[PDB]
Structures are given as C-alpha cells and as structure tokens.
Structure 1
Amino acid sequence: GAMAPSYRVKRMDIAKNDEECVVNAANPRGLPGDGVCKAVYKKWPESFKNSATPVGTAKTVMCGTYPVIHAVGPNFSNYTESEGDRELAAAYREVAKEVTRLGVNSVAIPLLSTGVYSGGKDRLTQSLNHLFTAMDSTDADVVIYCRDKEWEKKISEAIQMRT
C-alpha cells in the first residue's frame, strides 16, 4: 500500500502517467477505440491481447510487467440512466478488485463514461463519485487523469472537499 493513500488529479495524457498501473476506458470488444482508449492502444498495444470483457467489468492484461486494467463503462447512448448508473458503479468496483489483486501502490484512472460514452451529458460528478465509492477502501495512491481545464478544477475541488 501507499504510506498515506491519497487522491490527486492531473490534466494530461494518461499514456504519460507516473503510476504503477493504468486503467483503460475500454470498449467491450478490446478494439483500439478513441480518446483515452486510443492513447492506451498506442502506448501499450500488447495489453489488447484478449482484453475484450463485458460492460461493468474489468480485465487486466500485462504489457511487459506493466498492468493495463481494461475497465468497460456503459455507453449512455444505449443504456437507460438507471441501468447505465448501475454498470458504471460496477465497472469501478471491478477496478478496485484488480488494483487490490495486483498489489500496486499507485494507479492512473480516467473518468469512465465521461467522453464518447456519456450520451452527450456532463457525468463528471456521477463518474467521480462512483470512482470514490470503489477506490476509498483501497490503499493505492489514485491519480485521476483528465484533459479539460474546468474538469481539472472541479475534480481537484471534489478531492479537497473530503480532506
């Protein structure tokens, strides 16, 4: 575990992370995709060997010794708000199990279902609160990655509020 488990936010490409493993915002079919998924595919293409996994699940594949946790959040274009919310909570619980099992002291994690799977809604709070619910009982240092300047400020505020 980390000596003082923390949450941080960085506004940068998660493919450049400084952590012991990465969570991919994956698609169910283990395809290269777009956004975080495409960056992950460019950096760690070996991790897409048999990475296909259902919505609401996480599947880890090693790129050398570096673990890539493929977490499949729901596409809110396809799911009801109710069913999407349940699958998004579930994907993050499966990320917490994998981070624990791997014994890492840090993890780089994007906000699942906040991009092309958001169904054109702002889901920062929804996705961030499911991330906290899952990861709060883990002792890894968690570093949340984003690209938008206003999102970085809101994620930072939400982290500081609890401290």
Structure 2
Amino acid sequence: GAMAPSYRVKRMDIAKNDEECVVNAANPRGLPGDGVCKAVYKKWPESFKNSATPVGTAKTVMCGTYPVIHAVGPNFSNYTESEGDRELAAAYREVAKEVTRLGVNSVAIPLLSTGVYSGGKDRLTQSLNHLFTAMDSTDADVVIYCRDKEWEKKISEAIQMRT
C-alpha cells in the first residue's frame, strides 16, 4: 500500500499517467471506442484481448506487466437515472476490488460516465462521490485524470474539502 494514501487530480491525458496501473473508461464490447478509451487503445492495445465485460463490472488485462482495468460505466442515454446510478456505483466497487487484488500502490482513474455516456448531463459530483465511496477503503494513491480546466478546480476543491 501507499505510505500515506492520498487523492490527487491532474488535467492531462491518462495515457501519460505516472501510476502503477490505469482504469479505462471502457465500452462493454472491448472496442477501441473514443475519448479516454481510444487513448488507452493507442497506448496499451494488447490490453484489449478479451476485455469485453458487462455494464457495472471491471475486467483487468495485462499489457506486459502493466495492468489495464477496463471499467464499464452505464450510458445514461439508455439507463434510467435510478438504474444508471446503481450501475455507476457498482463499476467503481469492482475497480476497488481489482486495485486491491493487484497489490498496486497507485492507480490512475478517469470519472466514469461523465463524457459521451453522461446523457448530456453534468455528472462530476455524482461520479466523483461514487469513486470516493469505492476507493476510500483502499490504500492505493489515487490520481484522478480530467481534461477540462473548470472540472480540475471542482475535483481539487472536493478532495481538499474532506481535508
């Protein structure tokens, strides 16, 4: 585990992370996809061998010795707010299980269901709070990756508010 487990936020491409493993914001079919998923496909294409997994689950595939945790959040275009919220919570609980199983001291993680799976809503707070519910009992250093300058400020403020 980390000596003093922390949360941090960085505004940059998660394919350039400095952590011991990465969480892909995957689609259920293990396809290259777009956004974070396409960046992850270009950087770790070997990790997409048999990476298909259902909504609300995470499936780890090794690229060399580097673990890629494919986490499948719900597309809020298709799910009801209620069922989508349950699947989004579940995906992050499965990430925490994988991070623990792998024995890593650090993980790079995007905000699941905040981009093309957001159904056109701002889900920063919803997605981040489910990330914290899952990851608070883990001892890995967590580094959250985002692309927007206003999102960076809001995530940083949310981390600092817990102290």
Question: Shift in Å at residue 90 of structure 1?
Answer: 0.1
Q: Distance in 2 between matches of 1:74 and 1:67?
A: 22
Cα distance in 2 for partners of 1:77, 1:35 equals 17
User: Per-residue deviation at 1:50?
Assistant: 0.1
1:45 to partner: Cα distance: 0.1
Determine the C-alpha separation between the residues in 2 that align with 1:38 and 1:115: 13
**TM-score normalised by the chain length of structure 1:** 1.00
Separation in structure 1 between the aligned mates of residue 79 and residue 38 of structure 2, nearest angstrom: 23
The corresponding residue for 1:63 is: 63
Q: Deviation at 1:51?
A: 0.1
Query: 1:62 is paired with a residue of what secondary structure?
Result: strand
How many Å separate the matches in 1 of 2:136 and 2:35? 26
Superposition deviation, residue 17 in structure 1: 0.1
Q: Deviations over 1:104-127 (max 9, x none)?
A: 000000000000000000000000
TM-superposed CA distance for 1:94, in Å, is 0.1
Q: 1:100 and 1:162 mapped to 2: Cα distance?
A: 23
Q: Deviations over 1:32-91 (max 9, x none)?
A: 000000000000000000000000000000000000000000000000000000000000
TM-score by length of 2: 1.00
Q: Counterparts of 2:77 and 2:34 in 1: how far apart (Å)?
A: 16
Root-mean-square deviation over aligned CA pairs: 0.2
How many Å separate the matches in 2 of 1:105 and 1:128? 20
Provide the rounded CA distance (Å) in 1 between the counterparts of 2:76 and 2:149: 24
Shift in Å at residue 130 of structure 1?
0.1
Identity %: 100
The CA deviation at 1:155 is 0.1
Distance 1:35 1:129 in 2: 22
1:11 Cα deviation from its structure 2 partner: 0.1
Structure 1: gaps of 5 or more residues: none
Question: How many Å apart are 1:95 and its aligned residue?
Answer: 0.1
Query: Structure 2 regions of 5+ residues with no counterpart?
Result: none
Secondary structure class of the residue paired with 2:42: helix
Residue number in structure 1 paired with 2:74: 74
CA–CA separation in structure 2 for the residues paired with 1:124 and 1:38? 21
Partners of 1:31 and 1:78 lie apart in 2 by 19
Q: How far apart are the structure 2 equivalents of 1:46 and 1:25?
A: 16
